[PDB]
Design an enzyme around this catalytic site. Structure first.
Site, PDB file in Angstrom:
ATOM      1  CG  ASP A  70      -0.376   0.177   2.595  1.00 38.68           C
ATOM      2  OD1 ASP A  70       0.729  -0.177   2.859  1.00 38.68           O
ATOM      3  OD2 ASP A  70      -1.295   0.668   3.306  1.00 38.68           O
ATOM      4  CE1 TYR A  72       8.017   4.597   0.915  1.00 42.59           C
ATOM      5  CE2 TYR A  72       7.431   5.701  -1.251  1.00 42.59           C
ATOM      6  CZ  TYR A  72       8.266   4.889  -0.670  1.00 42.59           C
ATOM      7  OH  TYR A  72       9.260   4.308  -1.195  1.00 42.59           O
ATOM      8  CG  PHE A  83       8.033   0.672  -3.269  1.00 47.82           C
ATOM      9  CD1 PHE A  83       8.421   0.573  -2.036  1.00 47.82           C
ATOM     10  CD2 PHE A  83       7.451  -0.164  -3.986  1.00 47.82           C
ATOM     11  CE1 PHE A  83       7.586  -0.421  -1.504  1.00 47.82           C
ATOM     12  CE2 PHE A  83       7.055  -1.613  -3.314  1.00 47.82           C
ATOM     13  CZ  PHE A  83       7.363  -1.457  -2.291  1.00 47.82           C
ATOM     14  CG  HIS A 193       7.304  -5.117   1.903  1.00 49.63           C
ATOM     15  ND1 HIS A 193       7.914  -3.847   2.232  1.00 49.63           N
ATOM     16  CD2 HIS A 193       6.328  -4.568   0.944  1.00 49.63           C
ATOM     17  CE1 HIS A 193       7.148  -2.838   1.835  1.00 49.63           C
ATOM     18  NE2 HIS A 193       6.157  -3.342   1.142  1.00 49.63           N
TER      19      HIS A 193
END
Ligand code: URA
Ligand code: CL
Length: 229
Positions: A70, A72, A83, A193
């Site tokens: 999801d 930031y 990202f 992740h």
């Protein structure tokens, strides 16, 4: 740019609008969800006009899909490409720092000059998240609210294309897309992740960029030029 008020043909690139036709009502529902959040006194990220930004780069041109969790959670970071941050943002988010650490380790390139990943998007890397909005400061707060059907449809459509696809799935939520990538024209890489909470469980040393390129050329496709300024 409103999801509640305008059709996919006016929100996203033409190929994506067709690809996402099966979730047209769901996309409108998500716009209504975000409206309701704001009426209730809760905000969302990224900005409305950026929520679907990954789908403004051509569907036909995608070669690699990167999927995170999801956006930031800090206002000023999320830009609608997973990202990525604007070129003036610094310090970088921690997961981006980890991504760039792995980029340098894998590829041997210098550390990037900033956190803007648009070059990747322009080169056919789709920078997706499993969920496309978040409440500020509250990671995963919009999980389970309806975006998963949208991003499932995106993947299913990409996989159906008469084209190779390499997927990089970062984290548990992203990896729920893996069953939809089972066809012979698709290959998926999955790892933990890049978040600090998970990166030391197998993100570092995963070499996803060079592996994706090996996979692409093994399917007869050109590799991604990963080099960032
Ligand atoms: O876009 C982003 C940013 C942080 N973490 C994610 O999973 N995706
Ligand atoms: Cl995870």
């Amino acid at each position: 740019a409103s999801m509640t008020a305008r059709p996919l043909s006016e929100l996203v690139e033409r190929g994506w609008a067709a690809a996402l036709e099966p979730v047209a009502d769901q996309v409108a529902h998500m716009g209504q969800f975000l409206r309701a959040e704001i009426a209730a006194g809760r905000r969302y990220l990224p900005a409305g006009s950026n929520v679907l930004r990954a789908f403004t780069f051509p569907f036909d041109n995608v070669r690699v899909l990167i999927v995170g969790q999801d956006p930031y959670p800090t206002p000023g970071h999320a830009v609608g490409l997973s990202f990525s941050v604007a070129p003036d943002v610094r310090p970088w988010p921690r997961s981006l720092a980890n991504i760039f650490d792995e980029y340098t380790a894998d590829l041997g390139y210098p550390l990037p000059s900033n956190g803007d990943l648009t070059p990747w998007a322009q080169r056919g890397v789709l920078l997706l998240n499993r969920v496309l909005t978040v409440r500020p400061s509250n990671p995963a707060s919009h999980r389970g609210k309806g975006w998963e059907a949208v991003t499932e449809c995106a993947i299913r459509a990409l996989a159906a294309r008469a084209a190779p696809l390499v997927a990089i799935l970062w984290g548990r939520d992203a990896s729920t897309l893996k069953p939809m990538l089972a066809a012979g024209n698709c290959v998926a890489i999955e790892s933990p992740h890049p978040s600090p909470l998970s990166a030391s469980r197998g993100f570092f040393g995963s070499r996803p960029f060079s592996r994706a390129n090996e996979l692409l050329v093994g399917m007869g496709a050109e590799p991604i030029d990963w080099r960032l300024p």
